[PDB]
């Protein structure tokens, strides 16, 4: 009932057309909204709601390191219950202020890279290795895809460049991923380099999606190296 | 006839019986925490629960034929299905009915009328399509007919709860000699 | 009423009998024979020794099956004892915990083994330690019980029987042999201190 | 009358030993086991005697004060040893359908057939209800449970 | 208007569904939210401090027993763990009705529904019933009583 009470307070700051700066008790009343649930019960549904009063209120007093906070906790933790419908569609323009900000980083989603592949192009008769599952590269050109899971658009893919080994590495990819499907890739551009021969392995990649330098996001269910 | 009397005799002795409400409890448990245990792998828990019933046809017909004291069975068919139809109701008080042979009886059904190891079990959606229920006794059976030299070869065709209306098992008999010294 | 759906649903202005499978659910008797049974626990601990490294966790995922049926055997224990289904009423819950460890002790093995286990006994020195006793335990008999490790089917079923009940109850077994009646398995129970202090509020 | 028991598994070997009512020993276990391989070598070829050059059942008098079954039964063993006499013991065989031979040798001389038949019926219930339900008893392996050897020793004192 | 709940132990509803009267032809539009699991989270509250004692002989069967500033709740508790909750009631006036002997006909008339899915050794504790029958069921077991 306490519970009750106070989201009610909560849908009282959301009604009122006076304004407020914050005022350093909100601190411990969305901190307290949070902890009378154990989230850090398994009735998902009142979550989504109780998260949607603590990101209005957040909005409305301007803390936005707990926009930043909760709403990262609200994408991360839930929306298999979040279609196009049910504000999703008219979210995700609520945290590109978290983003024009530098409140949140690191791109929260640790599923992205689908698999790789490095196949070839041929170009010559038998310019070729006629005397020597590895691959030893051929110059040419790569086709990394990957997949997307929240069906919002815009994760605009820039900069997809390899790890810490060798020139062997990917150039540039201006372009866009879609909303929902596993997107294909356009042009990774490996610039290959003959050097020592002794085998090098890849796991996976830096991306940024307008955001800050990720580390290698690791193919999924699999090494799939 | 005889073997059918002494069946409904040979119910009333020593050991004592317990209500099937027990037995049908424990084994819908065992095949619960298998199936979740396999992460619904319906093919393995099928051999498993299989290879479950047949370590225990190997060892149930002592017991049958020392408290049912019983002679040879040299016919192959139709002392076979009224023993059978005596010889649950022995151990699981039930009356499967015997039909559906070959052109000499060889391949031939045992349709169970009623089930006791499912009275109530609604297996769910994915579980339709790579599952029998009972399989246990197409392990116990296999076994307990093994031990007495007749290789056969049970499988299930259809059952309730997988959709259908009947519940019953075909059986292939290969053969197998060297019985002992008699 | 999916979990990922909302609770939304259609008016009640229709009348949809399309129904399937729903059955009578009475205390049918049909008394299958201890071999049988005796056997399907056979092959049970056979796989259990067969798969578990050692003792205590052998004793846990023996003892996992007792708290898989533990609570179905209960609801629909107290549903014929307490209580198709023309009903009278259902009577009273457990009231305390010396009502529903005379539950265990009327009803329970009555429903399982026709006979009562001889005793109940609150113990000396301390309460939140309770004990039954078995006299002759009917399902594992055969077994040479040098090893106790046998018999924790029951304890895992009682403490499914006291989980719902909202007394968390650490459950073992021992065997004392204190009487000419031989193999006889106690079952010193206990609780956590929360729910006896709640009984510990009034008692 | 009846002072040891043994009985024999279907693969030709030993499954257990018991010394009852005769308390002074000279014979250890190995010597046991060859008695086992050559009375089930001896069971192998006394059956093609053929001497003929060409119903029989047993009977009920309720040894063991109930029985399990009351009942004139039938016996699978119609051509092989049965017993054997000397001058200073006897011995008894009883096969099953599956395989096991069932031994009794007594000391004094114990119609003689059939009440050492009528006793080796019980233990084969017996031996099928508390070590055939035993999750210790690997298969074909000796019988280490203790439960099965008192309720054993209680019927030779159930006999005599 | 009347709005279904079998909430669990763990806080979670293994069973919540809503209904219509044709008559009112929609439910609650704009307190369908707030009448939700907030309501329902002290309900459980109430009915938490409620059932461990003897006295506030019927140990399950509780009727109603809160009002918020809307409409007013009932109750029942089971053995099971589980809590039933219905919340019914026409939005414009203060339902008053508790009929409070045939809608007893139906905590313990539904109550079997949940037995026999329960029974059920695939099905799980703590995980919502996707029953598409015993859903169908209800409605029309609450044809009986309205």
Not at chain 2, 54 to 65: S, T
Not at chain 2, 81 to 101: D, G, H, M, Q, R
Not at chain 4, 68 to 78: D, G, L, M, S, V
């Amino acid at each position: 009932k306490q519970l009750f009470v106070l989201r009610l307070l909560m849908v009282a700051l959301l009604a009122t057309p006076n304004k407020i700066a914050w005022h350093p008790d909100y601190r411990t009343l969305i901190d307290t909204i949070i902890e009378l649930l154990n989230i850090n019960s398994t009735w998902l549904i009142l979550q989504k709601k109780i998260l949607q009063l603590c990101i209005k209120v957040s909005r409305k007093i301007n803390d936005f390191e707990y926009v930043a906070k909760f709403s990262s906790i609200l994408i991360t933790k839930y929306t298999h219950l979040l279609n196009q419908s049910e504000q999703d569609a008219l979210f995700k323009e609520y945290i590109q202020p978290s983003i024009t900000n530098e409140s949140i980083t690191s791109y929260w989603d640790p599923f992205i890279l689908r698999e790789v592949v490095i196949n070839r192009i041929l170009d010559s008769d038998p310019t070729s290795n006629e005397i020597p599952a590895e691959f030893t590269c051929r110059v040419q050109n790569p086709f990394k895809f990957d997949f997307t899971i929240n069906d919002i658009q815009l994760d605009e893919e820039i900069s997809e460049f390899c790890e810490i080994d060798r020139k062997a590495v990917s150039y540039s990819g201006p372009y866009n991923v879609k909303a929902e499907s596993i997107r294909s890739i356009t042009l990774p551009l490996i610039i290959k380099k003959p050097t020592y021969k002794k085998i090098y392995e890849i796991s996976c990649l830096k991306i940024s999606i307008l955001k800050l330098p990720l580390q290698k996001f690791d193919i999924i269910n699999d090494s799939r190296r | 006839r005889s073997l059918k009397a002494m069946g409904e005799e040979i119910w009333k002795n020593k050991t004592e019986k317990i209500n099937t409400e027990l037995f049908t409890l424990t084994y819908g448990s065992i095949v619960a925490q298998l199936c979740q245990d396999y992460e619904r792998d319906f093919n393995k828990v099928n051999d498993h629960l299989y290879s479950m019933g047949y370590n225990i046809g190997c060892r149930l017909i002592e017991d049958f034929l020392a408290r049912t004291a019983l002679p040879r069975c040299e016919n192959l068919v139709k002392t076979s299905e009224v023993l059978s139809k005596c010889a649950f109701k022995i151990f699981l008080n039930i009356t499967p009915n015997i039909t559906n042979w070959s052109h000499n009886k060889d391949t031939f059904s045992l349709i169970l009328d009623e089930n006791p190891l499912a009275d109530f079990v609604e297996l769910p959606m994915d579980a339709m399509k790579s599952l029998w229920y009972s399989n246990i006794l197409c392990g116990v059976l296999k076994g307990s007919l093994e031990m007495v030299q007749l290789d056969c070869d049970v499988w299930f065709v259809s059952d309730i709860l997988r959709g259908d209306s009947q519940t019953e098992i075909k059986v292939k008999l290969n053969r197998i000699l060297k019985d002992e010294i008699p | 009423v999916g979990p990922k759906q909302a609770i939304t649903s259609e008016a009640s202005t229709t009348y949809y009998i399309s129904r399937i499978y729903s059955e009578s659910l009475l205390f049918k008797r049909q008394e299958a024979s201890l071999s049988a049974m005796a056997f399907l626990f056979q092959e049970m601990i056979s796989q259990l020794h067969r798969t578990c490294k050692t003792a205590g966790d052998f004793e846990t995922k023996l003892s996992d099956y007792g708290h898989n049926i533990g609570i179905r055997l209960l609801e629909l224990l107290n549903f014929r004892a307490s209580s198709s289904n023309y009903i009278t009423k259902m009577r009273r819950r457990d009231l305390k915990i010396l009502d529903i460890l005379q539950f265990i002790h009327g009803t329970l093995w009555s429903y399982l083994f026709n006979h009562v286990s001889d005793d109940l006994v609150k113990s000396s020195e301390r309460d939140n330690e309770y004990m039954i006793v078995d006299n002759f335990p009917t399902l594992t008999q055969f077994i040479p019980g040098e090893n106790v490790s046998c018999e924790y089917f029951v304890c895992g079923i009682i403490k499914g029987f006291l989980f719902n009940a909202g007394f968390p109850c650490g459950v073992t077994a021992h065997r004392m042999p204190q009487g000419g009646h031989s193999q006889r398995t106690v079952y010193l129970i206990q609780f956590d201190r929360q729910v006896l202090d709640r009984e510990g509020l009034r008692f | 009358a009846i002072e040891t028991i043994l009985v024999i598994n279907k693969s030709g070997g030993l499954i257990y030993q018991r010394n009852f009512t005769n308390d002074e020993q000279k014979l250890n276990s190995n010597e046991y086991l060859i008695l086992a391989s050559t009375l089930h070598g001896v069971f192998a070829i006394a059956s093609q005697l053929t001497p003929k050059a060409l119903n029989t059942i047993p009977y009920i008098p309720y040894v063991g004060m109930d029985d399990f079954f009351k009942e004139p039964f039938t016996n699978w063993n119609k051509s092989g040893l049965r017993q054997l006499c000397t001058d200073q013991f006897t011995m008894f065989i009883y096969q099953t359908l599956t395989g096991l031979k069932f031994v009794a040798i007594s000391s004094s001389v114990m119609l003689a057939i059939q009440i050492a038949d009528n006793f080796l019926r019980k233990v084969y219930c017996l031996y099928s209800d508390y070590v055939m339900k035993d999750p210790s008893y690997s298969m074909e392996m000796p019988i280490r449970s203790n439960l099965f050897d008192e309720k054993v020793k209680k019927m030779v004192e159930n006999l005599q | 208007p009347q709005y279904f709940a079998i909430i669990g132990k763990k806080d979670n509803p293994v069973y919540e569904i809503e209904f219509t009267n044709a008559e009112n032809p929609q439910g609650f539009p704009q307190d369908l939210k707030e009448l939700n699991p907030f309501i329902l989270h002290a309900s459980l509250d109430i009915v938490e401090d409620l059932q461990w004692q003897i006295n506030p002989t019927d140990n399950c069967y509780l009727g109603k027993v809160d009002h918020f500033y809307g409409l007013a709740i009932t109750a029942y508790i089971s053995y099971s763990g589980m809590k039933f909750v219905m919340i019914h009631g026409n939005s414009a006036n203060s339902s008053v009705v508790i009929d409070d002997n045939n809608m007893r006909s139906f905590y313990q008339e539904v109550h079997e529904l949940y037995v026999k899915t329960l029974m059920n050794p695939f099905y799980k504790i703590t995980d919502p019933i996707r029953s598409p029958a015993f859903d169908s069921r209800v409605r029309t077991l609450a044809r009986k009583h309205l």
